[PDB]
């Protein structure tokens, strides 16, 4: 039961990292586009 | 026992990714601030 609970919590932690990476990809793409345009 | 050991190792791998994302968020924020200031 502690193992299932750990996997559940780790999945939430994984989702947070996936969402964070998506945010950062969009932010650096916005910067690269700005610099290209300038 | 292999499952507990795998969850332990995966938690270390998750911590490394969380730390890495924090580093990158700070780096792109520093760049966005530089560009705003310029």
């Amino acid at each position: 039961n502690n193992l299932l609970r750990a996997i559940e919590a780790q999945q939430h932690l994984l989702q947070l990292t996936v969402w964070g990476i998506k945010q950062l990809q969009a932010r650096i793409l916005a910067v690269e586009r700005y610099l290209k345009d300038q | 026992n292999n499952l507990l050991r795998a969850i332990e190792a995966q938690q270390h791998l998750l911590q490394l990714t969380v730390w890495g994302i924090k580093q990158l968020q700070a780096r792109i924020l520093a760049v966005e601030r530089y560009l705003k200031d310029q």
């Binding site: 502690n2 193992l3 919590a9 780790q10 947070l16 964070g20 | 969850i7 911590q15 924090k22």
Partner: peptide
């Protein structure tokens, strides 16, 4: 859908909270 600074500080809190729980679960085992 662009997270601001406060949303990133909530992200950090939520990551700390899940990490603390997982540490306890793996120890308690």
């Amino acid at each position: 859908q662009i997270w601001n600074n406060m949303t990133w500080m909530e992200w950090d809190r939520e990551x700390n909270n899940y990490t603390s729980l997982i540490h306890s679960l793996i120890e308690e085992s």
